[PDB]
Design a protein around this nucleic acid. Structure first.
Lengths: 79, 108, 203, 62, 190, 141, 196, 174
RNA sequence: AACGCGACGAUACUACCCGCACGUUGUAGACGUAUAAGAAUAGGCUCCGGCCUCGUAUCCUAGCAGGCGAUUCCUCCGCCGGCCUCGAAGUGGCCGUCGGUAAUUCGCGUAUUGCAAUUUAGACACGCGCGGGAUCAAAUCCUUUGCAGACGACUUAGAUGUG
RNA sequence: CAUCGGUUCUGGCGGGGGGAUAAAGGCCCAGGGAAUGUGGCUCCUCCGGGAGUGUUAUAGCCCUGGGUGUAAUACCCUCGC
C-alpha cells in the first residue's frame, strides 16, 4: 500500500468519556452474566483436578519418585 | 596590577515558585545554585543569605539598584535545587534571572 | 552544572526529542543555546517511519483558508528541531516567548560559530543511547525528501569549512609539539624545590 | 493515454532532447554568442587586486 | 537467549591479500581488487591462523549470530571473484524476428553497453549499460549467446538480470510468444 | 596469503582479571556468574585497595591491565591473597596511569587556601621559564 | 541566492536615470554623480576590487540593461531597467564579458534568432472589479432570479461554517503576471531595412 | 517479589481432649517478613490439611540463612503458575549465590516473560544442582563452560546525569 | 512574510562621521559571563616514543576595585599603521612604532565605611553636549496620462525639451 | 549576632540486646570426595595448543565434625551524645 507517501486519516487513541463509561458498564454486566451462567452451568466438572505431575527435565525426578515409593511403603507399614 | 576578580558569592538562578501542577505559592522560591547537584551539596548552603539584585528607574538614596534579601531554607528534590524565603516574594518576571548566594552566615 | 554566556551544541549524532527536551529545559532556566548542524540530527527507527510521520503532518491544513491559521510545514532541518523544541515550551505565554528568544538553530556551521567550542549532550547521543542493531535516520535526509532545497549548498560549505579546519589543526599540532619541547627544555631551568613542591601539590 | 508526467514519455523526450533538438540549439547558440562577442570586443590593497573590505545578528550580544 | 560467543572462519588462498580496516574489506588477487563496506553488521575480525580469517560476535542474539554466515559467504565470493572470476552466459532466442545485439565499450565511462534491436519486430532500440567491471562479449562457439564476465558476482548477475528484464513481452500469451534473452549458464571464468 | 586485520582488542573478564571499583578499591575475578555479575575478592594489605569477597556487577567495575596468572576458578581468600602478593598486584597498580590520575585528584582535592596561593605562584615561576623556552624555540623556526 | 555587489558603468543616460526618480523635472539629478568619481579616483581601484569580488565569490552573474524608450513613439521618457543573466563560460568569463559590454547597445538579433521558440513575460490586460460570471466562467442563474443572476447560488451548503478559498468570488480581473511559453519567432526585422 | 528471606514455619492444630498432641507441620516459605510468612503458611495449610488459623497456632518461625553465600551455585526450580489456560508446570534454572537470590530472580523472570504475578506462582522445589552434568538449560550451560572468558564491547561510560554538556565525544571501548 | 533578508543610488536639517563628556535613558537579567580539529564508537589519537573511563582538564588567576618609588625582567597585554587575509549572516595572521606590564625582592601608603547591608564598577542600544571634519537631497498634494481604475491605488508627463 | 523556649527537617558519633548467642569468612586440627583434573606422565600437532590418565604433586576446589569463639559484620530492636 502507499501508506508512507499518502497516509490516511489517523485512528485516534484518545478516548471519549461516553465510550469509556459504556465499556465499563458492559464489562460489569458481562461479569454479572458470566457469574449467573456459571451458577446455572450444566457442564460436568471433576471433583479433583488432574495434576500435571513432575516435569521430565527436573534432574532429581527419579529421586523424588523413590521418595514417594518410600513414603507410601512407610505409610502402608504404619497403617 | 591585579588581574583577578572580586566575586565572593556563588551564582544562582531563580527557577520557579513552590508549586504543584497548577497552584503556585510565591512565598517560597526555587533556586538553582551553580555547581550544586545533590542534596548533600545543598546542605552546605542552608541558612545562607541570598540577594536578588535588580535595577529601577528612579534614583533613591544614592542609587538605582534595589535588593530583595532572603535565606536558603531547605533542599528541594534530589538534584541540589534549594528552597528560599525572601522578605518579599520575588517577581514572577524574574524566572530565569540570577541571584547571589552569600557565604555568610558562616560556620567554617 | 555550570552557567555560560552561550552554549554552542554540535547537533551531529544527537537524538531529536532528547536534545529538544534538554534544550527546552535550559532555555526556561535562562541559558542561551545555539545548535548547529541540525541536518545531522538523528531520529530513532527506520527512515520510512519518519517519512510517514512527516507526510501525516503534511496532511493537516486549515480547510477554509490554507494561508492563515494552518499548520505551516517548515521543511528545513533546523526548523524541524525548532518545532520539536517549541512543542516543549509554553510558547503562548510571555515567559515561553522569552525562553524561545534565547535559542538559535542553524544548518551547517555558519561563522563565527566555526571558530567556537561546540559541546555535546551525552544524554541525547545516539551512540550512547540506541541499542546496537536498531535503525535510525537523518533529519537532513528527511528534509531533502520532503522539499528542503539547500542540502548540496550546505554540504559544499561544510566541505570548505572542514578544509580550513584541517589547516588550523595542522597549525595546532605544530603548536602543541613546540609547547612540549618548550616544557622539556625549561624543566632544566626551573628550581628543583619549585618542581618538587608542584609535584607534591599535584601539578 | 500516458500522462505528461509518465516515465516512458520523459525517456522519449530525453532521447529527443539529446539526439535531435540539442545539436540545433547548440549551433544557434554558437552563432548568437559569436555575434554578441563581436559586439563586446568592438600594492594589492591600493590597486584593488587584494580584495579588502568595502568602505539583526547571527550571534547574541556579548 | 543471548549466546556468549559465536565464530565463523574464512580460508584465504595463497595468492590472495585481504585487508580489513573498520569493517571495510579489500580483497586482492591475480584478477584485480574488490572492496566491500561491512560496517552495517556488528562483527569482530581477527587472524586466527595463517591464512584463516576469524569472524566473531559477542553476546549476540540468534539473528546477530546468523548474520555472520552471510558475511562469510560475501567475503568468500569476493575471494572467488579475484581468483577465478564469475561468468554468466545468456542466450537470446526468437521465433520470426531475429534479435540483433550489438556490444560497445564507452570510452568516456569505461562501461560496456548492449543495444538490442528488432525484438519481435519492434522499432525501438533497447539500451542497457553494464555495471563497471563487467565485460560483455558475443560468443563465437555458440549461436546467439552473450557472455558477461567479471570479478564482482553481484555486478555480473545484476547486469544479466537487467538484460533479462529489458526484453519483456507485454500483453501477449507467453505460452505462445517465446522470444527473450535468458541466463543459460552460471560459473567461473577459470 | 597476506591478511591484515586492524580491529578492536578489548580487555576480557576472566579468572584472574583485576577490577577497579568505583570507590577506588581493587578486586580479582574468582568466578564468572553471568555476563553481568562476577564473584570477586580483593585481599590487598592496603586498606584503600582492599575489597571484601562478594558479587561485583560489571557495570560498576572497570577492567585493569593486570591479570593474575593461573588463578584457579573458585579459589578462596587465602589462595587469592597468596597469588596477589606473589604477583605484586599493588605495585603494578601503582605504576598504572589510572592510579597516578587518582593520586593527582586526591592531591588537588586536599589543597588549602594557602596551598592554592602557593600553587599559583610556583606555577607562574615555572610558566615564566617555559615562556622563555617557547620564545627561544619559535625564534629558531 | 544573495546579491553580493553591483558594479555600474561610468556614464548612465538620462532615460535610465529617470528610473530612480518620481519627480525628475524638479530633481537636481544627482544620482550616480558621486559614483562616477570612483572611475577616476586611484585609477578605478574600487571598481576593480568589486569586479574581483564578483570573480572570486559569485556563481551567478547578471548584467543590468535598460531600454532606449526614446526611439519608441511612447510618451514615457523613463526607461525600463532589468537584470539579464549571462549563461555559459566560467565566472571570470562572465565578468569580463559584462565589463566589455558596459555602455554598449545590444540589438535583439544578438540575443534571439528567427525560428527560435521563446517565452514572453508580461502583465495582462486589466479589467477592474468583475463578477463571478466573467471572472470564473460560472453558469448564469435563470432569468429574474431574486437577488441577481450573475452570481453563485450557494457559496456554502456544507461544513465548515466558513466561506472556503476555492469558491468563486467577485474581485479584480486581469492585470496579472503571466509567463507564456513556446512562442515561435517568425521574423526579426531590422529597422534600417526599408523593406522589412 | 521483594527482598525475600527463607523462613521455616512450623504450626499445628490447637490441642483438644480427643487430640492432646496434634501433628506439627513445617514449610519453607519465601517471604519479605514474618507476618507474610505466617500468612502464606496458613494459606497453604488451608489448601492442604484443612487446618484453619482460628483452630491452629504457630509453633515456630525461624530464618534459614544460606550456608555458603560466597559460593556460586546453579539452582533448579520446579514451579507451577496460573494463567488464563490453567495451571502449568515449569522447570527453570538460575545461577546465583543463594536460594533467596534464585527465588527473587525467578519472580522477576516469571513477571518479565509470562506476566505471572506473586499469588499466581506456586514454588514446589528449589534444589542446588550438585553436578555440572545436572544443568539442563543452554543459558546456564554456556556459563559453566571450561575457561570461560569474554570481552565487553560497546560499554556506555557512566556519566553523571547532572553534567549536561561535555566538551569531548565519549568513547565506548572500556 | 504588509513585524523575513540582500545589493545599490542620492541623502538638505537639529540630519552624517570622528574625539571625549556624561546620563534619576533603556534592555527576560555581565561579575574570569576565557577554551574551533575532523572523524569512528565491533574503534580511535600521536611528537611515532607511546597514549585513550573521566573537562575532577587547560588557560588565566597576588598589588588602593589594586597606589607611589626602587630592585629586577624581556615575559605577557593593548591601540594604531603597512602587507596579506577572511563572503554561510564577512576578520583574523604577520611585521613595526608607541603605551602598559612582580618571573625575583623590598621601602612608604591603606585605619574612622566604626561588627553585615548590590562589591552602584560590564556590554549593547539610545539621548543630551561641545571641538572638529565631510554633504547641499528628496517625497507628497497639485496639473496631466489611460497601458490603470468603484474610491484609494497604478503606468506616465510637468525645470528650455526629440517639451 | 549571642543565649533560650515551642514545633520540625536533616547529618554524624558512642553503647546495649536478639537470631543457628546471625549465617559466612581467616588461621589451625581430623576425616571423606570429585572435576570445567593442577603438577607429572603418554600420544598428536599448524609447535600455538589439544586428547588421555588420575586425586595434590611444581595450582586449587567441594562435603562433614572440632578449636580460636561469647570472633567480626549484615539485618532487626533499643539507651544516649
Amino acid at each position: 500500500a502507499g501508506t508512507i507517501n499518502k497516509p490516511k486519516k489517523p485512528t485516534s487513541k484518545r478516548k471519549t468519556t461516553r465510550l469509556r463509561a459504556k465499556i465499563s458498564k458492559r464489562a460489569a454486566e458481562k461479569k454479572r452474566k458470566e457469574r449467573k451462567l456459571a451458577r446455572k452451568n450444566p457442564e460436568w466438572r471433576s471433583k479433583l483436578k488432574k495434576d500435571p505431575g513432575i516435569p521430565n527435565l527436573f534432574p532429581y525426578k527419579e529421586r523424588l519418585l523413590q521418595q514417594i515409593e518410600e513414603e507410601r511403603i512407610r505409610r502402608k507399614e504404619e497403617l | 596590577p591585579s588581574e583577578a576578580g572580586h566575586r565572593l558569592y556563588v551564582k544562582g538562578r531563580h527557577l520557579s515558585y513552590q508549586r504543584g501542577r497548577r497552584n503556585t505559592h510565591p512565598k517560597t522560591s526555587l533556586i538553582k545554585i551553580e555547581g550544586v547537584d545533590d542534596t548533600a551539596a545543598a546542605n552546605f548552603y542552608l541558612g545562607k543569605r541570598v540577594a536578588y539584585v535588580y535595577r529601577a528607574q528612579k534614583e533613591v538614596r544614592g542609587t538605582k539598584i534595589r535588593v530583595i534579601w532572603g535565606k536558603i531554607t531547605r533542599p528541594h528534590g534530589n538534584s541540589g535545587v534549594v528552597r528560599a524565603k525572601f522578605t518579599h516574594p520575588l517577581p514572577a518576571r524574574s524566572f530565569g534571572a540570577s541571584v547571589r548566594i552569600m557565604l555568610y552566615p558562616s560556620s567554617i | 552544572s555550570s552557567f555560560e554566556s552561550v552554549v554552542v551544541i554540535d547537533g551531529k549524532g544527537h537524538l531529536l526529542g532528547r536534545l529538544a527536551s534538554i534544550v527546552a529545559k535550559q532555555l526556561l532556566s535562562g541559558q542561551k543555546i545555539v545548535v548547529v548542524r541540525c541536518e545531522a540530527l538523528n531520529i530513532s527507527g527506520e527512515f520510512f517511519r519518519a517519512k510517514l510521520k512527516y507526510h501525516a503532518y503534511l496532511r493537516k491544513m486549515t480547510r477554509y483558508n490554507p494561508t492563515r491559521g494552518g499548520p505551516f510545514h517548515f521543511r528545513a532541518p533546523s526548523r524541524i528541531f525548532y518545532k520539536a523544541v517549541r512543542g516543549m515550551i509554553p510558547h503562548k505565554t510571555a515567559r515561553g516567548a522569552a525562553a524561545l528568544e534565547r535559542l538559535k538553530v542553524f544548518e551547517g556551521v555558519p561563522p563565527p560559530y566555526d571558530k567556537k567550542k561546540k559541546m555535546v549532550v551525552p544524554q541525547a547521543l545516539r551512540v550512547l543511547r540506541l541499542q546496537p542493531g536498531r535503525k535510525y535516520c537523518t533529519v537532513g535526509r528527511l528534509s531533502h525528501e520532503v522539499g528542503w532545497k539547500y542540502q548540496d549548498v550546505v554540504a559544499r560549505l561544510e566541505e570548505r569549512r572542514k578544509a580550513k579546519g584541517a589547516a588550523y589543526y595542522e597549525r595546532k599540532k605544530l603548536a602543541a609539539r613546540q609547547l612540549s619541547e618548550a616544557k622539556k627544555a625549561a624543566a632544566a631551568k626551573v628550581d628543583p624545590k619549585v618542581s618538587e613542591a608542584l609535584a607534591a601539590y599535584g601539578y | 493515454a500516458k500522462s505528461a508526467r509518465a516515465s516512458r514519455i520523459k525517456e522519449n523526450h530525453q532521447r529527443f532532447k539529446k539526439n535531435i533538438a540539442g545539436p540545433v540549439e547548440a549551433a544557434r547558440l554558437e552563432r548568437l554568442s559569436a555575434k554578441l562577442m563581436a559586439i563586446a570586443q568592438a600594492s594589492g590593497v591600493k590597486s584593488g587586486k587584494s580584495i579588502g573590505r568595502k568602505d539583526s545578528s547571527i550571534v547574541f550580544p556579548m | 537467549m543471548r549466546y556468549i560467543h559465536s565464530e565463523e572462519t574464512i580460508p584465504v588462498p595463497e595468492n590472495v591479500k585481504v585487508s580489513i580496516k573498520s569493517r571495510l574489506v579489500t580483497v586482492e588477487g591475480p584478477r584485480g581488487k574488490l572492496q566491500k563496506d561491512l560496517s552495517h553488521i556488528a562483527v569482530n575480525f581477527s587472524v586466527v591462523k595463517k591464512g584463516v580469517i576469524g569472524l566473531e560476535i559477542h553476546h549476540g542474539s540468534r539473528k546477530d549470530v546468523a548474520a555472520l554466515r552471510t558475511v562469510r559467504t560475501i567475503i568468500n565470493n569476493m575471494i572467488i571473484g579475484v581468483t577465478k572470476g564469475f561468468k554468466y552466459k545468456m542466450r537470446y532466442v526468437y521465433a520470426h524476428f531475429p534479435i540483433n545485439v550489438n556490444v560497445e565499450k564507452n570510452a568516456e565511462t569505461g562501461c560496456y553497453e548492449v543495444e538490442i534491436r528488432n525484438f519481435i519486430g519492434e522499432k525501438i532500440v533497447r539500451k542497457v549499460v553494464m555495471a563497471p567491471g563487467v565485460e560483455v562479449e558475443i560468443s563465437k562457439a555458440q549461436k546467439d549467446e552473450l557472455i558477461l564476465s567479471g570479478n564482482s558476482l553481484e555486478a555480473v548477475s545484476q547486469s544479466a538480470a537487467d538484460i533479462q528484464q529489458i526484453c519483456k513481452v507485454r500483453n501477449k500469451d507467453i505460452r505462445k510468444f517465446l522470444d527473450g534473452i535468458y541466463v543459460s549458464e552460471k560459473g567461473n571464468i577459470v | 596469503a597476506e591478511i591484515n586485520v586492524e580491529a578492536t582488542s578489548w580487555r576480557r573478564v576472566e579468572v584472574g582479571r583485576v577490577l577497579k571499583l568505583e570507590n577506588g578499591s581493587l578486586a580479582a575475578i574468582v568466578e564468572i556468574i553471568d555476563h553481568k555479575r562476577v564473584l570477586a575478592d580483593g585481599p590487598s594489605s592496603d586498606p584503600k585497595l582492599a575489597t571484601p569477597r562478594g558479587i561485583v556487577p560489571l557495570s560498576r567495575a572497570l577492567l585493569t591491565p593486570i591479570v593474575i596468572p593461573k588463578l584457579p576458578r573458585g579459589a578462596r581468600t587465602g589462595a587469592v591473597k597468596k597469588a596477589w602478593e606473589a604477583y605484586g598486584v599493588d605495585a603494578k597498580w601503582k605504576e598504572t596511569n589510572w592510579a597516578k590520575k587518582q593520586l593527582q585528584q586526591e592531591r588537588r582535592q586536599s589543597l588549602t587556601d594557602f596551598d592554592r596561593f602557593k600553587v599559583m605562584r610556583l606555577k607562574k615561576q615555572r610558566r615564566f621559564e617555559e615562556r622563555k623556552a617557547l620564545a627561544k624555540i619559535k625564534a629558531a623556526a | 541566492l544573495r546579491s553580493l555587489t553591483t558594479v555600474w558603468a561610468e556614464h548612465l543616460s538620462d532615460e535610465v536615470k529617470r528610473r530612480f526618480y518620481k519627480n525628475w523635472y524638479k530633481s537636481k539629478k544627482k544620482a550616480f554623480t558621486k559614483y562616477a568619481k570612483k572611475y577616476a579616483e586611484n585609477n578605478g581601484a574600487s571598481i576593480t576590487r568589486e569586479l574581483e569580488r564578483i570573480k572570486k565569490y559569485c556563481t551567478v552573474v547578471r548584467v543590468l540593461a535598460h531600454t532606449q524608450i526614446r526611439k519608441t513613439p511612447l510618451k514615457q521618457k523613463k526607461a525600463h531597467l532589468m537584470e539579464i543573466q549571462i549563461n555559459g563560460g566560467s565566472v571570470a568569463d562572465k565578468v569580463e564579458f559584462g565589463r566589455s559590454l558596459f555602455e554598449k547597445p545590444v540589438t535583439i538579433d544578438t540575443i534571439f534568432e528567427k525560428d527560435e521558440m521563446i517565452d514572453v513575460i508580461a502583465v495582462t490586460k486589466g479589467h477592474g472589479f468583475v463578477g463571478v460570471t466573467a471572472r470564473w466562467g460560472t453558469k448564469k442563474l435563470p432569468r429574474k432570479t431574486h437577488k441577481g443572476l450573475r452570481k453563485v447560488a450557494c457559496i456554502g451548503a456544507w461544513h465548515p461554517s466558513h466561506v472556503q478559498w476555492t469558491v468563486a468570488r467577485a474581485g479584480q480581473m486581469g492585470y496579472h503576471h503571466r509567463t507564456s511559453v513556446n512562442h515561435k519567432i517568425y521574423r526579426i526585422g531590422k529597422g534600417d531595412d526599408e523593406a522589412n | 517479589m521483594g527482598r525475600l528471606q527463607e523462613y521455616q514455619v512450623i504450626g499445628r492444630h490447637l490441642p483438644t481432649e480427643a487430640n492432646p498432641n496434634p501433628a506439627l507441620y513445617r514449610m519453607r516459605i519465601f517471604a519479605p517478613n514474618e507476618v507474610v510468612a505466617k500468612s502464606r503458611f496458613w494459606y497453604f495449610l488451608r489448601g492442604l490439611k484443612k487446618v484453619k488459623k482460628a483452630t491452629g497456632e504457630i509453633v515456630s518461625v525461624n530464618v534459614i540463612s544460606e550456608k555458603h553465600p560466597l559460593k556460586v551455585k546453579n539452582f533448579g526450580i520446579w514451579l507451577r503458575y496460573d494463567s488464563r489456560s490453567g495451571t502449568h508446570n515449569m522447570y527453570k534454572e538460575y545461577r546465583e549465590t543463594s536460594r533467596v537470590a534464585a527465588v527473587e530472580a525467578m519472580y522477576a523472570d516469571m513477571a518479565a516473560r509470562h506476566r505471572a504475578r506473586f499469588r499466581s506462582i506456586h514454588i514446589l522445589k528449589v534444589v542446588e544442582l550438585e553436578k555440572t552434568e545436572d544443568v539442563k538449560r543452554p543459558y546456564i550451560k554456556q556459563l559453566v563452560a571450561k575457561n570461560l572468558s569474554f570481552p565487553l564491547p560497546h560499554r556506555v561510560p557512566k556519566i553523571s546525569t547532572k553534567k549536561i554538556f561535555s566538551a569531548k565525544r565519549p568513547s565506548t571501548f572500556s
